Amino acid sequence: VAQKAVLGYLNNFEEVSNLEIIAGYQDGIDIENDKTYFVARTRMQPYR
Amino acid sequence: EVLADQMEEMIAVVDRMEDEPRLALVAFKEMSESWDVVFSYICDSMLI
């Protein structure tokens, strides 16, 4: 049963490794210190 | 696709090693006994 569970986790982790970035936005003018945010989606459908 | 004609005479599929990637490929066909009409796609195993 534990094996089943971990295999599920691994399965999802596949999609994690297949995540594709789409875009990003800077918090402010100072790239060298301002944080920044990014968005990405699944290659596999349905798109998440 | 939205094909101008009803290509419908089934499918052909194999793994390819004409090269090391071990690529995934799928094809479909229509029986023009000469100039046979084909529709197909090819994918990297990471679904690219």
Side-chain angles (χ1 to χ4, degrees):
Chain A
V1 170
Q3 296 189 42
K4 279 293 200 294
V6 70
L7 292 164
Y9 173 94
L10 289 163
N11 183 313
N12 285 38
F13 182 55
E14 306 175 43
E15 305 210 326
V16 182
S17 186
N18 285 270
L19 181 60
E20 297 190 333
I21 295 150
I22 300 299
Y25 182 79
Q26 307 163 14
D27 196 85
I29 187 175
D30 174 24
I31 292 66
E32 289 77 15
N33 298 274
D34 301 345
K35 67 199 296 180
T36 291
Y37 312 85
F38 313 90
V39 60
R41 85 169 194 170
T42 57
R43 273 196 287 274
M44 200 71 68
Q45 296 135 33
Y47 299 113
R48 312 202 310 291
Chain B
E1 159 61 330
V2 55
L3 188 57
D5 66 275
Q6 182 46 290
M7 184 182 308
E8 204 173 39
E9 176 29 52
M10 316 314 196
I11 189 178
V13 194
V14 300
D15 179 16
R16 174 183 93 199
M17 291 70 54
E18 289 185 318
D19 49 335
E20 69 291 336
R22 304 212 64 145
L23 202 66
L25 321 88
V26 284
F28 302 85
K29 56 196 172 65
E30 161 58 347
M31 307 298 92
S32 293
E33 185 158 53
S34 183
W35 207 266
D36 196 296
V37 196
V38 174
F39 174 55
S40 178
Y41 174 80
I42 300 174
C43 210
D44 309 328
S45 61
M46 61 276 274
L47 303 315
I48 297 172

